[PDB]
Amino acid sequence: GLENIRDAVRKFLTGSTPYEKAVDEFIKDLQKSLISSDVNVKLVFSLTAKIKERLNKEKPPSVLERKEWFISIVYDELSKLFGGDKEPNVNPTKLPFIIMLVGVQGSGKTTTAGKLAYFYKKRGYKVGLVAADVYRPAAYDQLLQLGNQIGVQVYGEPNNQNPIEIAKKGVDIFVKNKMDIIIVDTAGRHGYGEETKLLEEMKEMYDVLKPDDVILVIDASIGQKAYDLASRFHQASPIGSVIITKMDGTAKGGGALSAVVATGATIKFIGTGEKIDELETFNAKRFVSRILGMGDIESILEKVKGLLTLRDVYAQIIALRKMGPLSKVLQHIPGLGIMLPTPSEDQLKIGEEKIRRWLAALNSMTYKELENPNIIDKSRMRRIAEGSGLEVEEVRELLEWYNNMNRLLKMV
Amino acid sequence: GIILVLLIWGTVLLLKSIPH
After folding, report:
1. Is B2 on the interface with A (CB under 8 A)?
2. What's in the keyword line of the UniProt record (chain A)?
């Protein structure tokens, strides 16, 4: 479905045919894959849209083949779609951190709570599972079962028919072991025909218990449909995140992610199995890559990334030490290369662990002391020297150089 | 552009002050 993409990339990336007659087969195949992945259609043509707009105005950077630069846009774009920023802060803030699980029946609301509280235990916190799973008694059994199998306490008194009480009772008790994190799996009713039921039972819990985080589990089988419940969810609790489970037992995954994002919700994790370890933090970008191209996008990453005087000094010298292993460097300079056994002189320069003490002292300096250094004194000079590892001599040389250039450009 | 091919350029002329 959506996995057929890397190939569509491994082709577009093997000088298959002419540049433009290739761009299209991709767009054909991308749309095919996306839609075939259950991503909403209006979104797909939309995307390809903002993709042809960029191929238009955006101008290709150096060391960027007509096509690689291309993918840089694809990736970027597929990337905005599924995420749009960096990995959320699955890391708790205040202690204790409290988490509620509002999973619609069949959504693995419970398996996830386990899988999740193991996530955190395994990462070093003192997790506590509160079984407010009222609408399901079988959830109780199965819960404490996997619970004991992982060394986690699970408060709960069956048939209380009132979870909000179970919550306050159970969370206020998990402040005893000074537990760091508390996972409150709130009962999820209305099976599949949910409507607005759980949202009400929710705004309630939030008001009564008032926890630090609220996460609505979604079955990755719901395709782009997930957009409705998700949207009502975000609306209800603009301060919460979605977890999408069973990602691996469907071909309509993309539809859910793209979907849930469409609304504005955040996807902190994604279930990928029945097992307990089957749950990993959702890294939007790494996902787009994981699908576009293994690391092919990686090379594209290096290349694009690294790429009145002491200022330019740093920015300048910095981009130079970075460099990058390739012969396209001279593609910038109006000169045609002749032989290659020569650059081995460059690998050798990088040989000495420490390549330049200049970027070292330039770092050991204030961002102002980098501007007007004629204020630098001998005390300031041994300070910046010892701080960098250099000697007052390696630094005097440095300073004299900035000015000789200060004077030289004056002489032009 | 040539500006740096001079500045970043004429540096090694006396890269001699270095330790041993």
Report:
1. no
2. Cytoplasm, GTP-binding, Hydrolase, Nucleotide-binding, Ribonucleoprotein, RNA-binding, Signal recognition particle
Distance of alpha carbon A175 from alpha carbon A182, whole angstroms: 9
Rounded to a whole number of angstroms, the distance from the CA of B3 to the nearest CA of chain A is 9
- Experimental method, per PDB record: X-ray
Task: Tell me the nearest-neighbour CA distance from A406 into chain B, angstroms.
Answer: 10
| Chain B environment of A391 (Cβ under 8 Å) | 19
C-beta atoms of A397 and B7 within 8 A? no
To test the contact with chain B by mutation, choose from A308, A317, A358 the residue with the greatest count of B C-beta atoms within 10 A, namely: A317
- How far apart CA A198 and CA A102 sit, in angstroms, is 8
Rounded to whole angstroms, the Cα distance separating A111 from A275 reads 9
> Per CATH, which fold does A1-85 belong to?
Four Helix Bundle (Hemerythrin (Met), subunit A) (1.20.120)
Taking each helix axis from N to C end, the angle separating A5-12 and A19-35, rounded to the nearest 10 degrees, works out to 180
- Asked if residue A96 has a cis previous peptide bond (ω within 30° of 0), the answer is yes
User: Which of chain A's residues have a Cβ under 8 Å away from the Cβ of B17?
Assistant: 393-394, 397
Exposed / middle / buried, residue A36 (Cβ in 10 Å: 0-12, 13-18, 19+): middle
Tokens 């009502």 identify what position? Answer: A232
Kindly report the CATH class assigned to A304-412: mainly alpha
CB contact under 8 A, A401 and B11: yes
Nearest CA in chain A to B9: A317
CA-CA-CA-CA torsion sign (A90, A93, A97, A102):
negative
Domain limits, chain A:
1-85, 86-294, 304-412
| A307 SS3 class | coil
Identity of the amino acid at A283: N
Domain A1-85 and domain A304-412, same fold? Reply is no
Is 3.40.1280.10 the CATH classification of the domain at A86-294? no
From first CA to last CA, the distance across chain B in angstroms is 34
Instruction: Note whether A394 contacts B8, CB cutoff 8 Å.
Output: no
Contacts of A22 (CB under 8 A, 6+ apart): A12, A16, A67
For residue A405, which residues of chain B lie inside 8 Å, CB to CB? 7
Residue A24 phi, psi dihedral angles, 5° rounding? -60, -45
C-alpha angle A289-A263-A212 in degrees, rounded to nearest 5: 90
Determine the residue among B3, B4, B7 to mutate to test chain A binding: the one whose Cβ has the most chain A Cβ atoms within 10 Å.
B7
